[PDB]
């Protein structure tokens with residue numbers, strides 16, 4: 001689990017969105033596993049505006065943060081796992097690292113701010129849905 005709070009927006013994994021998220025929907029993309037809902041409280045996170053390919057992410061299944069190198073956002077085929085099916089997903093970045101389903105929502109951050117959130121995993125890789133291209137989250 002986990003979310004990004006920037007301005008009056010909440011960014012969450014689309015597959016983890018609640019009834020309140022869908023009732024206050026701002027934007028969603030089923031090809032990216034992202035959904036953004038509106039909030040009454042003002043959030044203070046900052047979204048990175050950059051092309052970094054190194055950062056740190058939080059892994060709840062290890063209660064640890066790990067430094068990683070990651071690929072630029074692209075269209076990737078995600079392999080089938082014990083509990084979830086295989087799929088194609090866009091704007092996804094991969095790194096070598098540990099990820100289990102419940103790790104979705106963990107934030108990847110660089111020196112500039114939030115880069116993305118854990119969205120895929122298995123086979124020794126971790127995949128993050130990028131948010132740096134969503135410029136409208138800044139206004």
Ligand SMILES: Cc1ccccc1NC(=O)c1cncc(C(N)=O)c1
Nearest residue numbers: 015033081099100101119120121122
């Ligand atoms: C994160 C992870 C790690 C290991 C194994 C599997 C996963 N995948 C998920 O929990 C997951 C569940 N629902 C949807 C998606 C998606 N990106 O569409 C991903």
Ligand SMILES: [Zn+2]
Nearest residue numbers: 050052110112
């Ligand atoms: Zn950066």
